Amino acid sequence: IKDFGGFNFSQILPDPSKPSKRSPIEDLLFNKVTLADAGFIKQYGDCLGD
Amino acid sequence: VFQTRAGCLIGAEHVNNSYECDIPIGAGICASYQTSQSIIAY
Numbered sequence: 001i002k003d004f005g006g007f008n009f010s011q012i013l014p015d016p017s018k019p020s021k022r023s024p025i026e027d028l029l030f031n032k033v034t035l036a037d038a039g040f041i042k043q044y045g046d047c048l049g050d
Numbered sequence: 051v052f053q054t055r056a057g058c059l060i061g062a063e064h065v066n067n068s069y070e071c072d073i074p075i076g077a078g079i080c081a082s083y084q085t086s087q088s089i090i091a092y
């Protein structure tokens with residue numbers, strides 16, 4: 001990340017100091033939308049117990 | 051026995067190298083028939 005002429009691209013380039021190497025705006029978009037499928041491995045014991 | 055995010059796969063040999071996808075499995079995993087020949091997952 002060098003002198004671009006005064007241009008900030010930090011909001012759109014990935015942030016190294018965090019996992020998954022994704023942008024802050026991408027973080028916000030990923031947080032706003034909620035999905036019912038947290039994962040894809042739901043075992044027989046999980047459904048039998050609850 | 052190899053555990054992926056799409057489930058656990060039985061009958062394939064895991065390899066550290068990366069190639070182009072031939073048969074899509076899911077969750078970033080593909081399989082192919084390669085060389086004394088066997089199925090591999092990568």
Ligand SMILES: *[C@@H]1O[C@H](CO)[C@@H](O)[C@H](O)[C@H]1NC(C)=O
Nearest residue numbers: 002003006007008009010011
């Ligand atoms: C804009 O870029 C400078 C470095 O050129 C950085 O110090 C600053 O924090 C950036 N802007 C924001 C809001 O992070």
